[PDB]
Design a protein around this ligand. Structure first.
Ligand SMILES: Nc1ncnc2c1ncn2[C@@H]1O[C@H](COP(=O)(O)OP(=O)(O)OC[C@H]2O[C@H](O)[C@H](O)[C@@H]2O)[C@@H](O)[C@H]1O
Length: 185
């Protein structure tokens, strides 16, 4: 654990190193593409551990609801992962020509992820540095946008959610999260 920040009474933000495929939390957020096709990065690790259940429920979801748009999130079965569900958030693909829009869409992915958690009555959620890998979002802007989006969501005391974790395997990204929490709070 790298930091702990009370967001509201009985609600904490925790930055931690760890593996989203195996955390003692209720649900996790995947950094997905629009097709819910988990063939790279975090998505691939999750899907591998999950067995084909997760990709198949995801195919049926696209084959039912249609392609997801950037900024949106949906939920699927988790298969063999230690969760009932995986929340798939589609971060934006970074363009330096549209940086404000990109920030908007990541904020949105984050907030919709939180809304889905609330809706399925979850009290703990873990979230990665959505968009900061293959999708190319500048790591610094990326982790501040996520932390700020989480800060806005609890500008009011009220929440099902009691613990929100920001998690990555790599320590640089985790440090980046811990710094963003300093700067933002
Ligand atoms: N094998 C891995 N295991 C755990 N974490 C990983 C792994 N690979 C990358 N990560 C971390 O997860 C975070 C998100 O990176 P990506 O998974 O590349 O997410 P985005 O950048 O949101 O990429 C979305 C796209 O990538 C995949 O191809 C996915 O199917 C979609 O097309 C980054 O911190 C990255 O270092």
């Amino acid at each position: 654990c790298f930091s702990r920040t009370v967001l509201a009474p009985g609600v904490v933000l925790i930055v931690q190193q760890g593996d989203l495929a195996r955390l003692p939390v209720d649900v996790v957020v995947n950094a997905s593409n629009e097709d819910l096709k988990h063939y790279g990065g975090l998505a691939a690790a999750l899907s591998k551990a999950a067995g084909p259940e997760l990709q198949a429920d995801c195919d049926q979801i696209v084959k039912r609801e249609g392609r997801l748009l950037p900024g949106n999130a949906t939920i699927s079965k988790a298969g063999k992962l230690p969760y009932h569900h995986v929340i798939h958030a589609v971060g934006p693909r970074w363009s330096g020509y549209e940086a404000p829009r990109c920030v908007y869409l990541l904020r949105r992915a984050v907030q919709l992820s939180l809304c889905l958690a609330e809706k399925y009555k979850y009290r703990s959620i873990a979230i990665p540095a959505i968009s900061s890998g293959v999708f190319g979002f500048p790591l610094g802007r990326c982790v501040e946008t996520i932390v700020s989006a989480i800060k806005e969501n609890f500008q009011f005391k009220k929440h099902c959610l009691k613990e929100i974790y920001l998690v990555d395997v790599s320590e640089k990204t985790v440090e980046a999260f811990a710094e963003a929490v300093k700067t933002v709070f």
